[PDB]
A = this chain, B = another copy of it.
């Protein structure tokens, strides 16, 4: 169990940006700029800085050229400069390695703290950032698939309850989770900004980064991303979806960047900002929990995720999950899922929904 520090937690506003290491900067630029339409704040031979349509901070995504594709940092904005000091004290009390740079790790961010958190994830906390032109009414630029905000991160970690307690002490509130009747937690979603999540924990070998999520205004904007991928004959890069989630109630799509970093496109979840927001627990065997329409979850969604780096830039060692596997208990050989609790009709035994089995 990760103890609660005596030192006060930093006041975290929201997820703010991710820095992803990519192997071919021009290929990655083609995906995030030419395909997905993100807006360039700055670029050079080594990095691309990108932001969503409604953002006013410098960026929501930094692509950094390097030898091994991986998550380098997931960054959260805090409420005041002083909260960066609070973060440093808090993580030092937790016995974590930290690095502080008064003028930032990446361009357009000022005083910043990066940490190897207790789950092995590279987190950044910052307040100071270069404001840029907020493009929210630049409909002369607006794409039919426009990504309007950064919404969340999702992390793969072997022990979800351990992680959940640590994030709750840091001030995230769990909005939804997936459990079974035998005490296992498979996933949890938790927020600061009053949406279903700012980060989330998915049970699996880790630390690895499951995805970064961007939102659109409307469901048709997500449809258009699919449509455009078809027209560009890159439909093999659509991993899963589009769908309606059970957890979050958002309309969703998962796609894969050139280094296989998974990106979610997301819209129309609900308000969670009240402190007694009802926490929703879904049973892992409920076949509407991930896709509300019952569509099967592709096995790569459960097995594949991005490497993460330590503060030296080396890949973090993976620790195997020993708790039960969501894949195995739902769509694997001894798996089970239901449409209606207690009804054999519309249940699935040892395979996925809708007539499919694991490849």
Contact = CB atoms under 8 A, between A and B. Distances in A.
Interface in A200-259: 217-220, 223-224, 226-236, 238-240, 242, 244, 246, 249, 251
A142 B144 contact: yes
A351 interface: yes
Nearest to A230: B292
Nearest to A237: B346
A229 B299 CA distance: 25
Contacts of A143: 144
A194 interface: yes
Interface string A291-320: 011111011100000000000000000000
A79 interface: yes
A223 B244 contact: yes
Nearest to A138: B231
A117 interface: no
Contact of A355 (B219, B268, B300): B300
Interface stretch (A65-73, A91-99, A159-167, A270-278): A270-278
A1 interface: no
Interface stretch (A38-46, A107-115, A129-137): A129-137
A238 B219 CA distance: 19
Given A80-B275, A220-B219, A275-B80, A139 B236 contact: no
Nearest to A253: B293
A345 interface: yes
- Chain B CB within 10 Å — which of A139, A273, A351, A358 has the most? A139
Contact of A359 (B56, B79, B144, B356): B356
Contacts of A64: none
B219 A223 contact: yes
Contacts of A268: 217-218
Interface of A: 13-14, 54, 56-57, 77, 79-80, 131, 134, 136-144, 146, 148-149, 193-194, 217-220, 223-224, 226-236, 238-240, 242, 244, 246, 249, 251, 268, 270-271, 273-278, 287-288, 292-296, 298-300, 339-340, 345-346, 351-359
